[PDB]
Amino acid sequence: SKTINIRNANNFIKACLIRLYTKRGDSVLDLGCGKGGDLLKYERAGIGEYYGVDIAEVSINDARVRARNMKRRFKVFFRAQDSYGRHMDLGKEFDVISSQFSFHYAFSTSESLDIAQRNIARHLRPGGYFIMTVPSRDVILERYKQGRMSNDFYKIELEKMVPMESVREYRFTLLDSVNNCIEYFVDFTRMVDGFKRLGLSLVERKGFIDFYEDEGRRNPELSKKLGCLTREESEVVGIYEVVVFRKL
Numbered sequence: 393s394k395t396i397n398i399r400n401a402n403n404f405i406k407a408c409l410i411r412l413y414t415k416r417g418d419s420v421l422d423l424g425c426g427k428g429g430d431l432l433k434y435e436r437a438g439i440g441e442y443y444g445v446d447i448a449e450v451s452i453n454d455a456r457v458r459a460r461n462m463k464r465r466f467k468v469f470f471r472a473q474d475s476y477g478r479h480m481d482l483g484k485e486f487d488v489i490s491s492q493f494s495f496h497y498a499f500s501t502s503e504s505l506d507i508a509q510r511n512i513a514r515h516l517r518p519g520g521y522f523i524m525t526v527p528s529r530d531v532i533l534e535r536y537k538q539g540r541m542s543n544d545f546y547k548i549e550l551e552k553m554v555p556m557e558s559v560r561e562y563r564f565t566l567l568d569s570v571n572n573c574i575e576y577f578v579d580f581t582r583m584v585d586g587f588k589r590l591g592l593s594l595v596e597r598k599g600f601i602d603f604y605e606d607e608g609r610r611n612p613e614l615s616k617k618l619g620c621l622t623r624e625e626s627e628v629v630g631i632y633e634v635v636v637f638r639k640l
């Protein structure tokens with residue numbers, strides 16, 4: 393693959409995010425878990441329980457097979473359902489709720505973002521954390537203004553016609569990944585506010601490149617266990633940001 397380093401970075405970043413906010417015996421709710429790659433990261437993290445939820449039943453399947461054939465200490469649970477725009481109640485809270493590269497899908501409509509925020513808040517133990525990695529609207533528009541919105545690895549198109557600050561969705565393509573996939577912008581303020589009203593407060597917001605470099609010059613061990621990036625790959629990785637809220 394040509395995307396390898398980008399995948400390596402992204403996973404590295406995720407593993408770090410997981411290292412920072414998880415502890416042994418912790419309970420995790422993975423929203424938009426996808427095929428379930430993070431299972432390993434969590435297994436190293438030493439958590440005691442993993443609940444994967446994802447609208448795509450095809451992906452849950454993969455995660456089931458994944459969990460079924462891996463070396464893991466934690467118990468697992470999986471469910472194919474919409475955890476953002478449809479009420480969700482699992483009957484229990486979690487120490488940590490994670491949404492990796494998926495929460496922006498919660499922004500389809502004001503109603504949808506709401507149902508999602510409520511679902512998040514009702515499955516989170518008081519004091520617990522809600523970690524995520526979402527595309528940065530601010531970054532995406534500034535690149536828009538710079539004129540460059542693509543390279544050999546990806547492409548982005550704004551569903552415009554009409555202020556760019558008024559645009560709420562765009563098309564995303566990633567080499568060896570999604571194709572012309574439609575994404576919703578993350579209305580950051582509206583998000584923060586909703587969560588605020590729900591008892592969750594913002595405790596962290598940092599970009600992929602800096603966070604990467606920082607955590608990198610912080611433990612060169614997991615790194616080598618990585619490398620450097622080309623300006624091109626860095627543009628892809630430079631799209632996302634880390635965002636954490638905590639239930640107080």
Ligand SMILES: Nc1ncnc2c1ncn2[C@@H]1O[C@H](C[C@@H](N)CC[C@H](N)C(=O)O)[C@@H](O)[C@H]1O
Binds near residue numbers: 493
């Ligand atoms: N409304 C939704 N409810 C639950 N999962 C969703 C929803 N919309 C999209 N998704 C999932 O979001 C996932 C996003 C993928 N980028 C996630 C990959 C995985 N979390 C990773 O970190 O590699 C897809 O697998 C979808 O099935």
